Design a protein around this ligand. Structure first.
Ligand SMILES: Nc1nc2c(ncn2[C@@H]2O[C@H](COP(=O)(O)O[C@@H]3[C@H](O)[C@@H](COP(=O)(O)OP(=O)(O)OP(=O)(O)O)O[C@H]3n3cnc4c(=O)[nH]c(N)nc43)[C@@H](O)[C@H]2O)c(=O)[nH]1
Ligand SMILES: Nc1nc2c(ncn2[C@@H]2O[C@H](COP(=O)(O)O[C@@H]3[C@H](O)[C@@H](COP(=O)(O)OP(=O)(O)OP(=O)(O)O)O[C@H]3n3cnc4c(=O)[nH]c(N)nc43)[C@@H](O)[C@H]2O)c(=O)[nH]1
Ligand SMILES: [Mn+2]
Ligand SMILES: [Mn+2]
Ligand SMILES: [Mn+2]
Ligand SMILES: [Mn+2]
Ligand SMILES: [Zn+2]
Ligand SMILES: [Zn+2]
Lengths: 352, 341
DNA sequence: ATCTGTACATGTACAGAT
DNA sequence: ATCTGTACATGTACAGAT
DNA sequence: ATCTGTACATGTACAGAT
DNA sequence: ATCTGTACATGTACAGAT
């Protein structure tokens, strides 16, 4: 039943190679342009992120996420009104994006965007354009057409190599699951800042950046067991990723049908399951034979998050992704009724 | 019982700090002399190895092992008579085939000279034992402390073909750990087999394993469950040391035999729950049983180099092995009287 | 003549295909 | 059960630069 | 290139609780 | 007797500064 759904959701090697070969050409070309004729983004490095590179992309290989990360030493952060996740950056190639020592996200994103657009114009063996800028998005989104519509988000990121900001001190609670050595090593990796980029008429709007832990999330997805052999060729398979896929599909299906659910996103699902993985750390609590129970307990957990208006960021405990300020109580109650319905009627929306 | 023995074997924080502070002074000084003064070993780097740094040193902090590793360009290895572990190898121009003995001699000469210039510590250089890669230092606070300074070539290429089927950790530590470990460099120490032969060393890998030894990532961490893997190693090591001090029939045996055996046992019994502290006795007993089988069948393969049998007739006499078997069997069946000495 | 940033060479895990 | 494409990590060769 | 500062893992020592 | 919490000690990886 749920196994037959996962069969449908499974990507096909044919579609994967056709998608990947075209995506790599465009990314490769954009990346080379960044390290050229004294461009402000010379030295920028590529880091593949998101569902496709975590092997939890469902249905089709039609959306890819790439981080163009730039190392910036000597930066100091100021936390933006105790939000936990938003910061001003302060201190040179990047001199054109400054204003009284404060690095403007929107100025930097604009030039980044301008360059990409120019480079996309010079591609004439692929049908590829740049999507209209959505406010509140750090991404420059490319729309490719070959066998299929394919989205690529190119995400500008500042890379800092110092210790993670204090707001994350109590985050990443993997001690009982992946352990203290994994946590210490992960926290020795750099942290990343992407441009917030909203037009919410607030102070420091265009100079605000948001933390990103996509690199850490990637490691976790691909190293997700308490046993080192979880899902390896001499280990036992778990159903952790399969649950993620199923929850992701439920949300996508609902989202494409109801615009009441615009505020919700797959990152909500990803964050919830990270908490569940912490709560149930044993690989045996994610046995393939117990896919139904496992999926069901995930749904149950997500409903509790919705009811209590509380789903803390996994890395930044005080940043509540389900705050009244972010998502209306009505939106949450709408999604609760929709989830509850599917759960109690055999998930009819899986058959669409 | 066995818990009371481990109490005795436990090092003391006081002795640890007193030993370490003196060892570090001498190593620090020797290391600087290798670079800061223009010698053929400029660029050599320090890597601490062995029981003390694996936290399986027993009784006293009186023996320390340090690798002075030197990165070298693309060398090519020729396997020395299919032994698996020994190879001829191809600034260092003075030691030309790169001669282990010639290189070790200069290394040794330098160290000896530097030790002469130390006048706040009582420290000398032990007489060279042939077939030893080490320059051994003898220190005295009031207490005797040995330090082996081990010259190593560091090579960054793929590990030699003789190791392809070694490190069988797939069902224990897993395929990702194995692949990553095998991406680290490998090392060659001048252990002669003759004077131009080097021996492979995986002390760096053994160190990672000792400190990352569970199937669960949390084994022995503050939010994990403690196992008795290291405690078994300690106990087996003590049994051998105690026997070795009493019988010179056992001169050919060493702690590396014990370490290799337990590596195989850890592979054979990968589950952390098969090494529960509550089952220390069973665990120790099954280790003894395994070691006796190695002795009976004259077979204890190197963990990294499967075809190199450390218990070959060529290395240890059948009589030595039969002697050790009777001695182990006796202790096992009489409540380990030798633990009370 | 030497040095180097870029591209390729080699290996393997994951997961889909047979 | 075996086989195969993609991604990703680490090493090294080399045309263009110094 | 070398050195120091920071953070945290792995030990040990011991008291109060179980 | 064992376990748990705190203190005290050493080791070790890596970033930023010199
Ligand atoms: N791909 C995708 N796009 C979505 C989803 N829901 C909405 N969108 C599109 O995002 C734009 C508006 O931004 P948003 O803040 O509402 O959406 C972001 C982000 O786009 C989304 C997750 O996308 P992703 O990074 O590609 O996800 P992943 O690769 O893990 O899975 P998959 O792509 O298979 O779904 O979540 C939102 N978001 C909020 N906070 C975060 C955060 O910290 N990190 C990330 N990565 N995303 C965050 C509009 O174009 C809208 O259509 C959605 O589910 N998927
Ligand atoms: N410390 C120590 N020394 C020993 C032991 N048995 C003999 N010796 C002394 O070593 C001289 C050389 O003879 P050998 O080649 O038989 O001895 C080596 C090596 O010395 C010994 C293990 O010593 P280690 O490396 O310090 O061990 P670790 O630090 O892990 O444990 P601990 O110090 O707590 O015991 O084993 C022998 N050996 C043989 N092959 C290897 C190998 O591949 N690697 C290593 N590391 N050792 C190997 C003798 O003259 C004698 O004085 C002994 O048990 N311990
Ligand atoms: Mn995505
Ligand atoms: Mn995206
Ligand atoms: Mn030793
Ligand atoms: Mn030694
Ligand atoms: Zn798994
Ligand atoms: Zn353990």
């Amino acid at each position: 039943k749920l196994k037959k759904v996962l069969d449908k959701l499974r990507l096909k090697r044919k579609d994967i190679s056709e998608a990947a070969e075209t995506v790599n050409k465009v990314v490769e070309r954009l990346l080379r342009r960044m390290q050229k004729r004294e461009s402000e983004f010379k030295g920028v490095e590529q880091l593949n992120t998101g569902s496709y590179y975590e092997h939890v992309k469902i249905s089709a290989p039609n959306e890819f996420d790439v981080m163009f990360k730039l190392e910036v030493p000597r930066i100091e952060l100021q936390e933006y009104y105790e939000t936990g996740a938003f910061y001003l950056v302060k201190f040179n190639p990047l001199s054109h994006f400054l204003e009284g020592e404060v690095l403007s996200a929107t100025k930097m994103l604009s030039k980044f965007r301008k360059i990409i657009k120019e480079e996309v114009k010079e591609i004439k063996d692929i049908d590829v354009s740049v999507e209209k800028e959505k406010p509140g998005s750090p991404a420059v989104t490319l729309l490719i057409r070959n066998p299929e519509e394919i989205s690529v988000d190119i995400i500008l990121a500042l890379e800092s190599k110092g210790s993670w900001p204090i707001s994350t001190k109590e985050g990443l609670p993997i001690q009982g699951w992946l352990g203290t050595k994994v946590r210490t090593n992960l926290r020795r990796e750099p942290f990343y800042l992407v441009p917030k980029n909203a037009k919410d008429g607030n102070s420091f709007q265009g100079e605000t950046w948001r933390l990103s832990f996509s690199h850490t999330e990637k490691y976790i997805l691909n190293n997700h067991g308490i046993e080192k052999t979880c899902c390896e060729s001499s280990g036992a398979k778990c159903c952790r990723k399969e649950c993620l896929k199923l929850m992701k599909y439920l949300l996508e299906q609902l989202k494409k049908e109801f615009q009441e659910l615009d505020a919700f996103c797959s990152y909500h699902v990803k964050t919830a399951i990270f908490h569940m993985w912490t709560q149930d750390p044993q690989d045996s609590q994610w046995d393939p034979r117990n896919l139904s129970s496992c999926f069901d307990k995930l749904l149950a957990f997500f409903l509790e998050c919705l009811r209590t208006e509380k789903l803390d960021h996994y890395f930044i405990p005080k940043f509540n992704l389900f705050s009244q300020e972010l998502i209306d109580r009505k939106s949450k109650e709408f999604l609760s009724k929709k989830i509850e319905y599917e759960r109690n009627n055999g998930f009819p929306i899986f058959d669409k």
